[PDB]
């Protein structure tokens, strides 16, 4: 179960970062699709365009306006750490 | 199912962490069964005690001789990224 889940995390990235432009990174449209479709829970209601834009600015540690796989990775793990702490 | 993939990530850990001493930490021995029954395709056959110490040394970033939930998400991000760079 831990192995199908880790490649569920891997294949999901590529599910959107390749739709447009750099096929190795998520741009905003791409990031919104992923979250909106694959991660609605950890979504709540902040569905503005203003919620997503700092939603993209905070995942984007490099500041290169895109989320690479690494970065998606630190995001998934913050979300893991956050839930854990809850249960 | 990404959100499904996070669920089991967080639970797989506690399924093993709550056996001995700290219940929110993995000691070399709980890590052992986690790694062996969960991530079998990552541990080939170097499973002696040096490939299992190594790992512990590897995993345990604060060096309290135990794997906590954050050091376990760092490790997991290392597996996914490995799976990723190979595509
Ligand atoms: Ca892209
Ligand atoms: Ca970036
Ligand atoms: Ca323990
Ligand atoms: Ca530790």
């Amino acid at each position: 179960p831990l192995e199908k889940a880790l490649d569920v995390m891997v294949s999901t990235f590529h599910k959107y970062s390749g739709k447009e432009g750099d096929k190795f990174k998520l741009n905003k449209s791409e990031l919104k699709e992923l979250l909106t479709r694959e991660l609605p829970s950890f979504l709540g209601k902040r569905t503005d365009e203003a919620a997503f834009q700092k939603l993209m600015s905070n995942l984007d540690s490099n500041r290169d306006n895109e989320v690479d796989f690494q970065e998606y990775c630190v995001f998934l793990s913050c979300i893991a750490m956050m839930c854990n702490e809850f249960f």
Side-chain angles (χ1 to χ4, degrees), chain A residues 60-64 66-68 71:
Chain A
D60 180 9
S61 45
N62 58 40
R63 295 195 97 152
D64 81 356
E66 277 242 33
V67 179
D68 61 42
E71 288 171 345

Side-chain angles (χ1 to χ4, degrees), chain A residues 5-67:
Chain A
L6 281 153
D7 213 284
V8 160
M9 304 179 234
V10 182
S11 58
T12 294
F13 176 104
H14 300 290
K15 196 136 135 206
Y16 304 79
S17 65
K19 283 216 222 201
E20 294 160 31
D22 192 359
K23 283 168 200 77
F24 286 133
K25 336 188 164 241
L26 308 161
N27 38 68
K28 248 102 33 163
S29 351
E30 270 173 339
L31 186 63
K32 172 137 173 266
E33 258 163 48
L34 190 160
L35 308 190
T36 220
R37 293 231 292 268
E38 310 285 357
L39 289 144
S41 300
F42 319 124
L43 208 252
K45 227 179 228 249
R46 256 332 256 228
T47 88
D48 39 353
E49 212 225 36
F52 305 160
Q53 186 70 105
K54 181 74 146 167
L55 240 72
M56 150 62 93
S57 332
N58 280 265
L59 290 199
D60 180 9
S61 45
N62 58 40
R63 295 195 97 152
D64 81 356
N65 214 59
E66 277 242 33
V67 179

